[PDB]
Amino acid sequence: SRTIGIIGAPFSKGQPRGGVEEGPTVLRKAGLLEKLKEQECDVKDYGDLPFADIPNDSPFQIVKNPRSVGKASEQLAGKVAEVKKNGRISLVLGGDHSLAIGSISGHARVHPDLGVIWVDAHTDINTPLTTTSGNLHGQPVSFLLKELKGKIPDVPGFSWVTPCISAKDIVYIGLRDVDPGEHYILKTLGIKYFSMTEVDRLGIGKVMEETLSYLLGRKKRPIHLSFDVDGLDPSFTPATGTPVVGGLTYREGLYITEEIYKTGLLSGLDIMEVNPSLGKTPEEVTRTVNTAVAITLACFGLAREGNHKPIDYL
Template sequence: MALRGPLSRLLRCTLSSCQQNRSHSVAILGAPFSKGQKRRGVEHGPKAIRDAGLVERLSNLDYAVHDFGDLTFKHLEKDEHFMHVPFPRTVGRANQLLSGAMSGAVGAGHTCIMLGGDHSLAIGSVDGHAQQCPDLCLIWVDAHADINTPLTSPSGNLHGQSVAFLLKDLQNKMPQVPGFSWMKPFLSARDLVYIGLRDVDPGEHIILKTLGIQYFSMRDIDRMGIQRVMEVTLDHLLARKQRPIHLSFDIDAFDPSLAPATGTPVNGGLTYREGIYVTEEIHNTGLLSVMDVVEVNPTLGATPEALEATTSLAVDVIASALGQTREGAHIAFPKIPEPKEDTELRL
């Protein structure tokens, strides 16, 4: 749509300092971490996504790409379970480190891409982003709601609990998990929208309903269409005021036929076109500030083709969130090139 580009640029000028000067500089933060769940291999996600050509794709979109490399996480030796939650201190410490790095990168004026790693990393990623942009809103694209508390979680895994750590509204339902005393929940339930849900635990369902969280399950997408879902999503988050968007994209939101190399696949997911439409619409707001891409697990690709499909899909959604269009672009050509006088036009 013709109005989108100029309109979004106009809006960007009126934004708070944390959103300015972001448009042409992208930071990549690798977070090779897997202790938020029990399947090893997801720590190789950042390398696999880079190997699929991420930096080159973003450079072709005319961005200055700053690849900050991978963070170094430590596994703490003495880290007993908390209730049935494994590795609480290790996950807490990793997220503390990521939060600091994310805050620094956002503060330096970059649009940031966090490559996971498992989805527990969204705790640090969103926390660090919020330190620079306290009025951010969160779009969570996922088969799962990741909003269990330690008391509702069937698995104990922290990658299924990230949102519960972020939400102010759940503060009095959360026990003190060791490793997380460095952070305070800051997000309001109304500043969050889910897209793609199809595997929601009973405890998560009561949380979503009690807090009145806006979500669009795969059934809602079937019923309304992805175009209407995005309209309502962006209206819900941005109608009152324009603010930075944090997009947390779990690759398992896509159908497992498209993204097989992931730890908790669920049938009946987003089509390629639905997923790309989501990121295109987010790009068109001009407000994307941080994007997480998580749960790409290269060791779970049954064949090299399955892995390649998953990683190139990850690169495609990132490129689309950063402005790659299906209609082409004329970055290299201000006008249609004309042959010089003395060149023969046709043979």
């Protein structure tokens, strides 16, 4: 086995909409823990993190809810490190993507040599000074990059943060909605990425080959997969805050995750931005939840060609 350590992170202060807080709930109600155990997985639920209320949390310049988001990630980082110290793959059922700051930070405490694969329609690499929205769920990567140390002002709630990954330790997959400042950072730091243009050009097969070769070429290491459900096309994951057309297909999403699993190096996983209250219909909500579940199950073994135990079936 690989073992799994489930972490519910019902948090939404990284952006405007509060429904993202139900992510852990509807995902759990979909039978995630059960379907995982139905597989060759040993699951341990660490519960839903209790994020205290920070009443006094006025914006920092344009940055909104800094202390709340800062504390939420600091809290999450501690939990993730713990489960990692327990020899399990951390699975964060999230609210908004700002939690990746804590998820990747906690993970790196135990595996500083980790590599990150970021599935998303966005790069979430805006800094507290380049952001136009001020929503922290669009800035997690800037806080984690060591090269961006010096460009990140002292934002309340984030003094505990220590950039743990370098520009060369991350690969983007699915980009199609990147701001100008974010694009400048991409090219300036020489960050490796496969926007939808590259997926269209090479095919998901070549994309994954290159992504894994890029991160595991020099040597094998722990992999942290940060999956934003809007990385996929909205026809598959509509109940999300920032949908963008022309996304990855259900198939490509399952292909990305099946290949990650096969490396046997998955160490940390984030399933983020699932907002049940944003589904235009109860059918769109189930579609989003069911797709999110399928993606997660694939990260832990579930193969489309089929699976079977080391037993003589005939």
